[PDB]
Amino acid sequence: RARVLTEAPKVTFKDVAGAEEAKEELKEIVEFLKNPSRFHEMGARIPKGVLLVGPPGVGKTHLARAVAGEARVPFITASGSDFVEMFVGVGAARVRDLFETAKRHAPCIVFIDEIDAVGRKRGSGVGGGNDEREQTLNQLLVEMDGFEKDTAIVVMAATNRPDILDPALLRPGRFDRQIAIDAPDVKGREQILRIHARGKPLAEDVDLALLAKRTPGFVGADLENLLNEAALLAAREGRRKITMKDLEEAADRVMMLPAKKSLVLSPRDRRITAYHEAGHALAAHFLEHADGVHKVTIVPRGRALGFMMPRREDMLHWSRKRLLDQIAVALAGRAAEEIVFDDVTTGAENDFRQATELARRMITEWGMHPEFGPVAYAVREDTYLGGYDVRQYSEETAKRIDEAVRRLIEEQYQRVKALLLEKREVLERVAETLLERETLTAEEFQRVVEGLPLEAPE
Amino acid sequence: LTEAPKVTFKDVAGAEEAKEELKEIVEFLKNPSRFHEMGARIPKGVLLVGPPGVGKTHLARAVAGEARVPFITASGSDFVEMFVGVGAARVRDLFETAKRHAPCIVFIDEIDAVGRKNDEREQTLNQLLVEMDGFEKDTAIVVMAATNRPDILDPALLRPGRFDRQIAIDAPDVKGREQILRIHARGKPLAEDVDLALLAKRTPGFVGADLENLLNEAALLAAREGRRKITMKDLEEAADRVMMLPAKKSLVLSPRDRRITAYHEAGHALAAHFLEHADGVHKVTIVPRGRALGFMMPRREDMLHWSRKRLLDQIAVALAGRAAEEIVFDDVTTGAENDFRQATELARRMITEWGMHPEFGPVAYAVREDTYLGGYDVRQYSEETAKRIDEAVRRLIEEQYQRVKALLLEKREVLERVAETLLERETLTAEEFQRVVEGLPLEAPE
Amino acid sequence: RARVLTEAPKVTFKDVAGAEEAKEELKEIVEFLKNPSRFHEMGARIPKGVLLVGPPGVGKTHLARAVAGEARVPFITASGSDFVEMFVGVGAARVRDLFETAKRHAPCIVFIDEIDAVGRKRGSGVGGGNDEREQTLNQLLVEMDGFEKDTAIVVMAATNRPDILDPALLRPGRFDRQIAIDAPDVKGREQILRIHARGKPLAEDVDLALLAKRTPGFVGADLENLLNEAALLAAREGRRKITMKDLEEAADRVMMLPAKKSLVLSPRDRRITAYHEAGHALAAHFLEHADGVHKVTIVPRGRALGFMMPRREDMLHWSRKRLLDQIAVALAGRAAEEIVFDDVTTGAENDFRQATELARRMITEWGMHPEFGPVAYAVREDTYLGGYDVRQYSEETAKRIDEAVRRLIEEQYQRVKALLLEKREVLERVAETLLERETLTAEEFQRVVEGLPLEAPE
Ligand SMILES: Nc1ncnc2c1ncn2[C@@H]1O[C@H](COP(=O)(O)OP(=O)(O)O)[C@@H](O)[C@H]1O
Ligand SMILES: Nc1ncnc2c1ncn2[C@@H]1O[C@H](COP(=O)(O)OP(=O)(O)O)[C@@H](O)[C@H]1O
Ligand SMILES: Nc1ncnc2c1ncn2[C@@H]1O[C@H](COP(=O)(O)OP(=O)(O)O)[C@@H](O)[C@H]1O
Secondary structure (H helix, E strand, C coil): XCECCCCCCCCCHHHCCCCHHHHHHHHHHHHHHHCCHHHHCCCCCCCCEEEEECCCCCCHHHHHHHHHHHHHCCEEEEECHHHHCCCCCHHHHHHHHHHHHHHCCCCCEEEEECHHHCCCCCCCCCCCCCHHHHHHHHHHHHHHHCCCCCCCCEEEEEECCCCCCCHHHHCCCCCCCCEECCCCCHHHHHHHHHHHHCCCCCCCCCCHHHHHHHCCCCCHHHHHHHHHHHHHHHHHCCCCCCCHHHHHHHHHHHHHCCCCCCCCCCCCHHHHHHHHHHHHHHHHCCCCCCCCCCCEECCCCCCCCCCHHHHHCCCCCCCHHHHHHHHHHHHHHHHHHHHHCCCCCECCCCHHHHHHHHHHHHHHCCCCCCCCCCCCCCCEECCCCCCEECCCCCHHHHHHHHHHHHHHHHHHHHHHHHHHHHHHHHHHHHHHHHHHHCEECHHHHHHHHHCCCCCCCC | CCCCCCCCHHHCCCCHHHHHCCHHHHHHHHCCHHHHCCCCCCCCCEEEECCCCCCHHHHHHHHHHHHCCCEEEEECHHHHCCCCCHHHHHHHHHHHHHHCCCCCEEEEECHHHCCCCCCHHHHHHHHHHHHHHCCCCCCCCEEEEEECCCCCCCHHHHCCCCCCCEEECCCCCHHHHHHHHHHCCCCCCECCCCCCCCHHHHCCCCCHHHHHHHHHHHHHHHHHCCCCCECHHHHHHHHHHHHHHHHHHCCCCCHHHHHHHHHHHHHHHHHCCCCCCCCCCCCEECCCCHHHHHHHHHHHCCCCCCEHHHHHHHHHHHHHHHHHHHHHCCCCCCCCHHHHHHHHHHHHHHHHCCCCCCCCCCCCCEEEECCCCCCEEEECCCHHHHHHHHHHHHHHHHHHHHHHHHHHHHCHHHHHHHHHHHHHCCEECHHHHHHHHCCCCCCCCC | XCECCCCCCCCCHHHCCCCHHHHHHHHHHHHHHHCCHHHHCCCCCCCCEEEEECCCCCCHHHHHHHHHHHHHCCEEEEECHHHHCCCCCHHHHHHHHHHHHHHCCCCCEEEEECHHHCCCCCCCCCCCCCHHHHHHHHHHHHHHHCCCCCCCCEEEEECCCCCCCCHHHHCCCCCCCCEECCCCCHHHHHHHHHHHHCCCCCCCCCCHHHHHHHCCCCCHHHHHHHHHHHHHHHHHCCCCCCCHHHHHHHHHHHHHCCCCCCCCCCCCHHHHHHHHHHHHHHHHCCCCCCCCCCCEECCCCCCCCCCHHHHHCCCCCCCHHHHHHHHHHHHHHHHHHHHHCCCCCCCCCHHHHHHHHHHHHHHHCCCCCCCCCCCCCCCEECCCCCCEECCCCCHHHHHHHHHHHHHHHHHHHHHHHHHHHHHHHHHHHHHHHHHHHCEECHHHHHHHHHCCCCCCCC
8 A cells, every 4th residue: 555655744734725614624633633532532523534526636635635744644545446456355355454554553544546446336237346346345344333432543535426436435433424625716726826836937927816717627636737737838948937828828738638539618618517507506596485405606526416315315304396396407407508509418417317316216216196106116225234226116117117207307307498498588697607707606696696796806 | 887878760760749749758858957946847757559569669769869868678577587575676776776867768668567467576566666656856767668558557557656648659651661661771772663662552551670670681581692682572572471470470451351441441531521510520540450459448438528419420420431331332241340339329328318309308217337447337217118219229320320321422532532542551640631532632742 | 286297298299190280380389398498588489378179089188298298398287177166266276276386397388178167257157157267267367467488388278169268268378279180080090090009919901091991980089999999808808819890899889888878970970960061061162252261071070160250259351241141151051951861950050059140140239231220239348357248129129139030040041052952963972972081172172063073092
């Protein structure tokens, strides 16, 4: 094997830009870990395993390290992958070998890039892809329940995407939490840009505030490599000093660089995204039996699948009506897109998958009274090693369900569409102000709704 | 000891952007300090994607040709079969050797002997590993590595701070191997009309080394027979000859198989090229080999989110490949599987996954799973909607396929042309394509 | 555990009769292994794993040993079976223990009787028959990629039947080859007969040439036990000297001996086989758009399933037309048999399974335009641990496929049949000259076609 960071890294929370919540919510880990001792015996406690979710290069590792390097014990990191790639049984041996090594530091941090390599299980990817994960994983879970308070330590996992994880990983006693981080906040990329922008000279005409405002985009790692990029552009021309445009174009170079091919969020992909996010937002927003909440933006990217998931997994009981209205909201995105654009639409799925599920649900599992009664065509359990969904009906019923569900969805969809277009003018507005400025708080959101402008002086 | 390294690309043929995307490195290699103070930095290690004898090692030092600085050699095999801890102890002395040599290159060879996924080799691994991690900004170093199969190389090595990077070097060409045979033309004379100009041709798919070796022994086939000098024929024979053993160990393809493959790629290319509300891309070739691989990967990473018709235009392109064939050819066809496999996998996508509106709609009948080891879709729906999905997918496809067949049918010359030139001149690039397209030949350019 | 042959066996290539190709194709292993050293560093190389395919007792082991005792390192043999019979995890431990032991001899030979015990994998023989073989197998695969040139060594596998092996084993770096051996060549059984015929006296009237010519039959082990048999017949009557007929009848005794029951290739089973082989041969042979090749015989026995397999697995692109014509050829066998014989036919399958497969293929996988379009109803991949075929359509389509396929086959069949009977007179001829003489080279094959005889003086 693993990676030990000997006795302190460098870096800390003054080396990370933005993301307050993440920061302060992790507080209690940071300084708690300063003192484990007087701590546990005081009746207080800790998650003692932690996950954050964000894009690649959002500052995950970065944050983790800032913690590890401030509150601070060695930062022991490994990548999930390093694991499953291995054989039957050797995997387990490791999860532990890793731990014990990390364990003798009380307190300490286990940080694991990409725990996706483990969390999940099945009976479908049959024969090659099942056993291991759950296997070596438990080794980790057993490790997790295998403590008590003495050892102050924190397991820290990074992945772009909460779900692919078996929910077994969220249980109390290990990672019992979620902190997602949308880094690319304007001020965020200001601060970020800069911290990296120094090792290098700047033509005066360079002022971050404007580059920053016009990047988005954009992400921490993205930015750094942009900057570093420009620096070297000059570096190779035997040159010296980088005016704004060098940095600029470096921004483009990077912008077309990612993956193996040209792929760019252009003067639209943003637009599209924003008309969407407006679609949802606007939808969730109505009066007289409005069902939903409010928090708008651009580029969260792990979360759109929150409705059910975050709250579903704890408990509380939903109203049918609601569920539909919300399904409607899910489809809001597409609806918008169809409304405004070329009546060509965009491979932007998860929404459907949600609404779909909510409905397959409505029919089978929760009694909701289509032509299928209050009878349970769906069982799903969460057993300590278990906790997933599989179910008994007959080809026929299974089909009656495909039909019904498609109907639920369609009908609902058509509703939300009609509503959006009804409010269209508003649709554009929100969409727009959004796409250029890229964030709104629920209030001023609604504010742009009444057709009355606002901005803050800054 | 170590001083002025050899060659340079002045003796290297083709592989342009490869290098001058290297020139960045070569430079730091000459002028290192220039960054640290300056707050700049470099890939710090690099690898090559290509067969054996493509000019990999060749370029790996050719850099040092201009970068002009000790160019250190360590093969991967040696590390394995020494012994315990020595398997490590070597690689170690290895760098600090390469080291206060700042600037300079450290080439390693046949990584697989190391870069894999129970003791030995991976101690070499963890060793190499830690160093580069055991490391600093200030220090000026570029490691080198070359392999024919990025695949089995344990992806750990491919991290950041490590090789976050590389270049594929496409082995032959029609000109490429000519101009290579060239750099190797000087040593020895010869009397025929041919310049190798065509000889390059008479050699189908072929690699730089496989050329050089060929030559030398043509010059021997010379020297022996009491020779001055070489004949077109001599080499030529040296070629077909040295060949017949790789003919066992490698593949020849008939004046037909070529044909088609040229026509396919022609049809593909065209299909992604058209006017008035329609969508595509461009670059083209025939590479008897690198082809087969180049595909798997884009599937594993196949990602962006693209717009509904686009996908129909894609579908249009794959099926376009076949269609081209059917049109221009003897009215028989050929296992050209993967095109279909993916027009299929797209359309099937569009139905069951990305809400796109056959009589299916905004519901999610299939879901994907993700990240890497695998990534791909779990299916939830009942036999009927399965039947439907099939029916629909068949239409979607057949619809497109008869559409593209239409396009290709008509623009048919252009099909011809692109195919022909391509066929004989093993590759096209970007621009000239458009040219070949419009009543416009090329002469001997640059 | 395993079997070490201490420091040289006896036996060599002058102890093996016939089978030139096998011999000389293996050359480079033989003498290469004499010198591993100057060898690998010269840029040359080796398969370093090798399989041959032939009946039981064809001289497989025999050949392998001849190599090992000549080119020569100890001959380390084991049987595949000795393996799978074992428990979870212990298998692997062995493959290796075996190797290491064999490995310290540089160079050396691993020869494994009957590797069938491993190569294969699934998701069908579910629960008892899958895991381990792929498991312990990989152990062997990993062993295989686990080298480099230093160690000159050869893994040598024997099995009557290429297919049951997972294609994963054919990959370069380890067994990347096939050498099949039809031993029972006339001259073959001459030479063989004799080498064994010594230890014993012979009535003068005994001349091998004739026994040999009239054995076939017949195989090396078969023969030896025949001979040894006669010898003992006499041995038990307190007797001395074996005239021709003792050897003869020994031939019969053996001929009814095999398995647990009477089973004989009689004065027909040959005939049948011959009419078949002629059926194929004759079929593959036409003009004006003939599609196929030529190489006739009796008793190859591993190969009839070559069309696709050998060439399929590397690459090159087939013409539909062809594929049909060839399918037609596959069915040629049955067709003939139906034509000439009692309109009862013979449980001789593989052909059908072939044609069938080529068609199931044509429809689903390769675009070929029945009522199913150029759409991919078949995926099959070769992934390094993977490399097999499984596929997504709907009961309905699956069925449309059953129909279509049976039609393809039937229709094609009916074609070849008509063709054969059209050429019947020729059919017989080839069939016949064959049955008695048991081999033809493609040319003289045809010659017998024009109705003009030939033979060589010998
Ligand atoms: N908020 C940030 N501030 C400074 N640097 C950042 C930030 N976010 C990303 N980076 C750059 O990216 C690196 C960390 O990437 P990270 O976000 O951990 O990737 P992932 O999202 O896959 O965890 C850091 O070393 C840093 O240079
Ligand atoms: N572009 C090229 N120009 C000149 N020679 C080349 C070129 N490509 C390959 N060669 C010849 O092939 C030989 C081997 O090339 P290389 O790719 O280093 O082999 P390997 O793949 O075994 O490392 C070189 O010594 C060189 O003479
Ligand atoms: N070509 C041959 N020459 C001499 N003996 C042979 C030959 N083929 C088979 N035999 C006899 O059979 C034995 C080898 O059997 P073998 O062919 O290896 O069985 P399998 O086909 O199962 O490998 C030899 O010891 C020998 O007695």
